[PDB]
Design an enzyme around this catalytic site. Structure first.
Site, PDB file in Angstrom:
ATOM      1  N   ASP A   1      -5.936  37.210  75.563  1.00  0.00           N
ATOM      2  CA  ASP A   1      -4.937  36.380  76.179  1.00  0.00           C
ATOM      3  C   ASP A   1      -4.999  36.996  77.603  1.00  0.00           C
ATOM      4  OD1 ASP A   1      -2.435  35.333  77.078  1.00  0.00           O
ATOM      5  OD2 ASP A   1      -2.063  35.072  74.965  1.00  0.00           O
TER       6      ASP A   1
ATOM      7  N   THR B   1      -0.368  29.989  77.281  1.00  0.00           N
ATOM      8  CA  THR B   1      -1.175  30.347  76.335  1.00  0.00           C
ATOM      9  C   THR B   1      -1.587  29.101  75.343  1.00  0.00           C
ATOM     10  OG1 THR B   1      -0.560  32.438  76.380  1.00  0.00           O
ATOM     11  CG2 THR B   1      -1.256  31.718  74.275  1.00  0.00           C
TER      12      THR B   1
ATOM     13  N   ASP C   1      -2.687  40.099  78.387  1.00  0.00           N
ATOM     14  CA  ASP C   1      -1.366  39.314  78.995  1.00  0.00           C
ATOM     15  C   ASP C   1      -0.193  40.151  79.121  1.00  0.00           C
ATOM     16  OD1 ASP C   1      -0.524  36.410  79.560  1.00  0.00           O
ATOM     17  OD2 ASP C   1       0.870  37.123  78.039  1.00  0.00           O
TER      18      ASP C   1
ATOM     19  N   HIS D   1       1.517  33.316  85.216  1.00  0.00           N
ATOM     20  CA  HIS D   1       0.458  32.332  85.230  1.00  0.00           C
ATOM     21  C   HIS D   1       0.970  31.199  84.696  1.00  0.00           C
ATOM     22  CE1 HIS D   1       0.498  32.833  80.817  1.00  0.00           C
ATOM     23  NE2 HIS D   1       0.736  34.026  80.994  1.00  0.00           N
TER      24      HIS D   1
ATOM     25  N   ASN E   1      -1.651   2.487  83.834  1.00  0.00           N
ATOM     26  CA  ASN E   1      -0.837   3.344  82.732  1.00  0.00           C
ATOM     27  C   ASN E   1      -1.318   5.049  82.797  1.00  0.00           C
ATOM     28  OD1 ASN E   1      -3.387   3.116  81.724  1.00  0.00           O
ATOM     29  ND2 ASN E   1      -2.845   2.098  79.933  1.00  0.00           N
TER      30      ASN E   1
HETATM   31  C1  NKP Z   1     -11.817  27.809  68.331  1.00  0.00           C
HETATM   32  C2  NKP Z   1     -10.558  28.743  68.695  1.00  0.00           C
HETATM   33  C3  NKP Z   1     -10.547  29.403  70.174  1.00  0.00           C
HETATM   34  C4  NKP Z   1      -9.062  29.701  70.043  1.00  0.00           C
HETATM   35  C5  NKP Z   1      -8.944  30.997  69.264  1.00  0.00           C
HETATM   36  C6  NKP Z   1      -7.289  30.899  68.889  1.00  0.00           C
HETATM   37  C7  NKP Z   1      -6.833  32.147  68.078  1.00  0.00           C
HETATM   38  C8  NKP Z   1      -5.394  31.644  67.762  1.00  0.00           C
HETATM   39  C9  NKP Z   1      -4.348  32.797  67.209  1.00  0.00           C
HETATM   40  C10 NKP Z   1      -4.886  33.805  66.711  1.00  0.00           C
HETATM   41  C11 NKP Z   1      -3.801  34.680  65.944  1.00  0.00           C
HETATM   42  C12 NKP Z   1      -2.798  33.946  65.725  1.00  0.00           C
HETATM   43  C13 NKP Z   1      -1.619  33.844  66.881  1.00  0.00           C
HETATM   44  C14 NKP Z   1      -2.008  32.668  67.961  1.00  0.00           C
HETATM   45  C15 NKP Z   1      -0.891  32.384  69.280  1.00  0.00           C
HETATM   46  C16 NKP Z   1      -0.624  33.542  69.650  1.00  0.00           C
HETATM   47  C17 NKP Z   1       0.504  32.934  70.774  1.00  0.00           C
HETATM   48  C18 NKP Z   1       1.136  34.149  71.661  1.00  0.00           C
HETATM   49  O1  NKP Z   1       1.158  35.086  71.022  1.00  0.00           O
HETATM   50  O2  NKP Z   1       1.521  34.065  72.819  1.00  0.00           O
HETATM   51  C19 NKP Z   1       1.932  35.058  73.264  1.00  0.00           C
HETATM   52  C20 NKP Z   1       2.303  35.105  74.741  1.00  0.00           C
HETATM   53  O3  NKP Z   1       1.231  35.407  75.349  1.00  0.00           O
HETATM   54  C21 NKP Z   1       2.876  33.759  74.963  1.00  0.00           C
HETATM   55  O4  NKP Z   1       3.085  33.394  76.605  1.00  0.00           O
HETATM   56  P1  NKP Z   1       1.914  33.100  77.801  1.00  0.00           P
HETATM   57  O5  NKP Z   1       0.910  34.206  77.375  1.00  0.00           O
HETATM   58  O6  NKP Z   1       2.903  33.608  79.032  1.00  0.00           O
HETATM   59  O7  NKP Z   1       1.622  31.758  77.924  1.00  0.00           O
HETATM   60 CA    CA Z   2      -5.674   3.197  82.369  1.00  0.00          CA
HETATM   61 ZN    ZN Z   3      -2.094  33.721  77.245  1.00  0.00          ZN
HETATM   62 ZN    ZN Z   4       1.452  35.147  79.723  1.00  0.00          ZN
END
Ligand code: NKP
Ligand code: CA
Ligand code: ZN
Ligand code: ZN
Ligand SMILES: *[C@@H]1O[C@H](CO)[C@@H](O[C@@H]2O[C@H](CO)[C@@H](O[C@@H]3O[C@H](CO[C@H]4O[C@H](CO)[C@@H](O)[C@H](O[C@H]5O[C@H](CO)[C@@H](O)[C@H](O)[C@@H]5O[C@H]5O[C@H](CO)[C@@H](O)[C@H](O)[C@@H]5O)[C@@H]4O)[C@@H](O)[C@H](O)[C@@H]3O)[C@H](O)[C@H]2NC(C)=O)[C@H](O)[C@H]1NC(C)=O
Ligand SMILES: *[C@@H]1O[C@H](CO)[C@@H](O[C@@H]2O[C@H](CO)[C@@H](O)[C@H](O)[C@H]2NC(C)=O)[C@H](O)[C@H]1NC(C)=O
Ligand SMILES: *[C@@H]1O[C@H](CO)[C@@H](O[C@@H]2O[C@H](CO)[C@@H](O)[C@H](O)[C@H]2NC(C)=O)[C@H](O)[C@H]1NC(C)=O
Ligand code: K
Ligand code: NA
Length: 788
Positions: free
Chosen positions: A121, A159, A261, A415, A670
């Protein structure tokens, strides 16, 4: 209700589906509060840490330890990842020389190379420069595998929208996760990055990779990890799953790290404090690779190392406040920060006055660090409008800045900005038998990855926004053979069939084998004629200086193609020809525009697709004034267009050793990014049925080898394109009171586009006759000239 009384005995991180009343033991149970009572106890062991030490080698297996160094650990598949290095004299993977992997080298029972997606991230592309001094494992993956200098995320560069884009190949406007936070006016509900609502499936559109895999009988590991599960355990879990019996073992795995991140936000991207988290990620990568080596999988698995977005320097001192511009900010809700989305605090509040708000937000400070847009006016390359969860009013914020509602610090990074911004670019590396060896590839967009991951897994991708084949050059094998779309409408070639006397159009021109093909096509149509991929009626028209595909339905060219040599001369429009429009005896008066409509519409003027300024001769210039070369343009737009036609095209020719230009109209009333059908067009020239384009495009091609003239190019091509908004004013350009040389190019750069974008918007298919492979051409069509 879930019966937590059960046990996770022999069930830790099980892959099977388990619903109420049964309690769970999978990596998402904590998030659902449905874990068995002994989950934390049996499944999240921490005893003795994550590494074998000499003093643990050949130990008696204690089931209380986080990982094992006992002699049997390998068969059970739960050795600490460094077990063999510490206990069996092996080397860490990173210390091993890079060796090309020409075919998968997999153990008995493996039918295909597993795919492991390792997502980080907030990993800014430029962090890779820190190299093996900071990130030796990642540097080995990068240098020995296939890498891009950077990968472009989607907007907004946060994210949730980006991870789900990676998983689906879709723009956020299509998958539905249009922000980390969003309001859906039909649900009347709010999705937050933290909170329960996000678990409801109604929010999540398209078809993510794990579902695609499952529906096609390919088993996926988890793509979600509970925040409470430490990275070392996520890695041990993936390795454990890879040790499963042939009939249970997944083919695709995902790891996710919330770093770098978090540290980026706290310390900024260039902070010295960024070194530690980068070291920690690399350590995790080494655990994975050491573990894979231990399993004899290090030359079997394909690994993708990929980020969701970058990180910019953003501090408290650089915050714009809406309260400085608007009288009552307490009546609006603002999605704030590195982007703005505005709606009334009270949903559907009738007193909400968006035109007055936008007025007060438009060019009100000299150094204003954001710009308001109605969403349909945002650059088309962002693809950020066709969803009900996207507020009508948007603020594009300047890099390094924040926008907030009012003044009523601990962060140095953020970001979310425009996805062409350098600081927002992220990382891509592919390593393994299916990727190329020691190969660099041009930057590409994250929407393209879903197709490639499907390719890597033998899956047929669900409909998505990638261009399948455009990334074939990343792969040694498993490439996708694309197929040229079939043309739907063949053109007419109208000869003369009318006399000037046949025309009653209101046009006047105060002055006075023509239009046969050869050799117009070979000079002005360098890559074949565009295929029209919808049902319609149009004519090919030839001219000394240009060729066009004139639509008898929309009463103007779908496309106008012409070549300008490096040497070409720019000329004036003679005084007596200022208002010259000429009827075209090739095309029936019934399928022509009439100048009366222009004379009568007090707001709409007109312009030409081929510029009279670039005519080859005083004689030839007369072709440029044909009614079949004319298009409706607001005077505001004409300011931009004339400068483009008279100054910029020639400048491009001079700089690029000649250019080929294809220009034309786009109708997207649209705002769904797709060619409008007749019914969807909403504006016509006053008193007429001449439709008004929402945008005008230009595609400018030359030879990648600039030493060769555009018309005599033997190799790869270079392309830049634009989709310029057709608007009644230049409010978008704060400096537009000044000379065009002071603001027009700035506007054009903001509205740069991919040829592929234009294709979606026009139903045309470009570059069908070239000396290049179809895959190379697909790459060319996805290219975006960013001007960064
Ligand atoms: C085909 C897959 C390509 C993507 C692989 C995705 C794996 C997604 C998840 C893995 C483990 C579980 C949690 C996933 C979501 C975590 C979301 C999160 O922890 O964001 C925290 C933070 O930074 C949020 O804000 P911003 O970084 O400021 O946008
Ligand atoms: Ca159109
Ligand atoms: Zn992120
Ligand atoms: Zn972030
Ligand atoms: C990027 O690539 C995508 C995928 O190919 C293209 O999006 C597709 O556009 C086509 C043509 O306009 C649409 O076809 C229509 O389909 C509907 C029925 O669609 C329903 O069923 C399909 C299949 O199961 C499903 O994918 C659709 O999902 C939409 O609606 C869901 C429920 O509300 C929502 O959860 C999901 O996110 C998605 O919403 C998005 O699309 C809708 C339009 O359907 C749009 O209003 C919304 O704002 C989002 O943008 C849906 O349940 C038929 O009735 C029509 O006749 C027609 O066949 C596809 O539905 C649509 N697919 C998806 C997944 O978005 C984009 O055009 C392409 N963009 C560019 C620029 O090239
Ligand atoms: C919730 O879980 C516990 C454990 O499975 C269940 O308790 C069992 O119930 C059966 C049927 O009456 C007994 O014979 C077993 O001896 C119990 N197991 C243990 C180890 O206590 C309980 O029934 C479940 N609650 C329900 C079904 O609502
Ligand atoms: C747009 O900005 C102007 C200020 O330029 C705001 O005008 C104020 O309006 C209130 C009542 O609406 C008056 O009492 C003040 O005298 C005005 N201020 C000035 C300096 O003229 C206006 O309210 C703003 N509009 C919106 C929608 O926020
Ligand atoms: K006019
Ligand atoms: Na202006």
């Amino acid at each position: 209700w879930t019966n937590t009384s059960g046990s996770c005995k022999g069930r830790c991180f099980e892959l099977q589906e388990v619903g109420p009343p049964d309690c769970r033991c999978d990596n998402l149970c904590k998030s659902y509060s449905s874990c068995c009572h002994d989950f934390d106890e049996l499944c999240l062991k921490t005893a003795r840490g994550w590494e074998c030490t000499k003093d643990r080698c050949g130990e008696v297996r204690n089931e209380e330890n986080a990982c094992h160094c006992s002699e049997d650990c390998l068969s059970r598949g739960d050795c600490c990842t460094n077990y063999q290095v510490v206990c069996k004299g092996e080397s860490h993977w990173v210390d091993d020389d890079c060796e090309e992997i020409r075919v998968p080298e997999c153990p008995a029972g493996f039918v295909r190379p597993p795919l492991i997606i390792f997502s980080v991230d907030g990993f800014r592309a430029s962090y890779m420069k820190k190299g093996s001094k900071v990130m030796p494992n990642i540097e080995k993956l990068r240098s020995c595998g296939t890498h891009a200098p950077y990968m472009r995320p989607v907007y907004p560069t946060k994210t949730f929208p980006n991870l789900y884009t990676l998983a689906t190949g879709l723009y956020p406007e299509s998958h539905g996760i249009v922000g980390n936070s969003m309001y859906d006016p039909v649900f009347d509900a709010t999705f937050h990055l933290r909170g329960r609502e996000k678990f409801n499936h109604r929010w999540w559109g398209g078809q993510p990779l794990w579902i695609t895999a499952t529906k096609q009988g390919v088993r996926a590991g988890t793509f979600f990890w509970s925040v409470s599960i430490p990275h070392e355990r996520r890695i041990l879990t993936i390795l454990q799953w890879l040790s499963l019996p042939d009939n249970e073992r997944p083919s695709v795995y995902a790891f996710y790290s919330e770093q770098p991140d978090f540290s980026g936000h706290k310390y900024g991207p260039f902070g010295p404090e960024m070194t530690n988290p980068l070291r920690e990620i690399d350590k995790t990568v080494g655990q994975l690779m050491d573990g894979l080596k231990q399993l004899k999988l290090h030359r079997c698995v394909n690994v993708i190392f990929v980020g969701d977005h970058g990180m910019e320097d953003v501090t408290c001192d650089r915050t714009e406040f809406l309260s400085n511009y608007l009288t009552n900010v307490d009546d609006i809700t603002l999605v704030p920060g590195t982007l703005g989305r505005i709606r009334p605090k009270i949903p559907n509040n009738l007193k909400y006055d968006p035109k007055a708000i936008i007025a007060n937000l438009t060019c009100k400070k000299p150094d204003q660090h954001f710009k308001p847009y109605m969403k349909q006016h945002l650059p088309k390359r962002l693809h950020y409008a066709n969803n009900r969860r996207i507020e009508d009013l948007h603020l594009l914020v300047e890099r390094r800045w924040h926008v907030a509602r009012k003044p009523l610090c601990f962060f140095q990074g953020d970001h979310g900005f425009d996805n062409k911004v350098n600081s927002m670019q992220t990382v891509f590396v592919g390593y393994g038998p299916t990727f190329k060896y020691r190969t660099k590839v041009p930057p590409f967009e994250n929407i393209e990855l879903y197709n490639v991951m499907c390719d890597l897994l033998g899956l047929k991708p669900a409909p998505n926004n990638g261009t399948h084949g455009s990334l074939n050059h990343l792969l040694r094998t498993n490439t996708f053979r694309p197929t040229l779309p079939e043309e739907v409408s063949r053109p007419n070639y109208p000869g003369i069939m009318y006399l000037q006397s046949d025309f009653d159009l209101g046009c006047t021109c105060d002055d006075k084998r023509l239009h046969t093909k050869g050799s117009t096509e070979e000079r002005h149509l360098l890559y074949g004629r565009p295929a029209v991929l919808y049902r319609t009626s149009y004519d090919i028209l030839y001219h000394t200086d240009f060729e066009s595909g004139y639509s008898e339905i929309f009463l103007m060219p779908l496309w106008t193609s012409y070549t300008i040599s490096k040497q070409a001369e720019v000329s004036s429009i003679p005084e007596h020809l200022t208002n010259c429009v000429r009827p075209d005896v090739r095309v029936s008066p019934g399928f022509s525009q009439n100048c009366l409509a222009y004379k009568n519409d007090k707001q709409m003027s007109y312009g030409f697709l081929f510029p009279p300024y670039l005519s080859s001769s005083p004689e030839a210039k007369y072709d440029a004034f044909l009614v079949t070369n004319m298009v409706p343009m607001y005077p505001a737009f004409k300011r931009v267009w004339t400068y483009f036609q008279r100054v910029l095209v020639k400048k491009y020719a001079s700089e690029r050793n000649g250019v080929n230009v294809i220009s034309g109209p786009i109708f997207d009333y649209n705002y769904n990014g797709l060619r409008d059908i007749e019914d969807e067009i909403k504006q016509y020239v006053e008193g007429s049925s001449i439709p008004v384009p929402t945008h005008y495009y230009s595609i400018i091609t030359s030879c990648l080898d600039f030493t060769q003239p555009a018309d005599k190019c033997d190799g790869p091509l270079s392309v830049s394109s634009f989709i310029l908004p057709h608007r009644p004013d230049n409010d978008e350009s704060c400096n537009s009171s000044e000379d065009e040389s002071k603001w027009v190019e700035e506007l054009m750069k903001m509205h740069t586009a991919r040829v592929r974008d234009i294709e979606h918007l026009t139903g045309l298919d470009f570059y069908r006759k070239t000396s290049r492979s179809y895959s190379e051409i697909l790459t060319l069509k996805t290219y975006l000239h960013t001007y960064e």
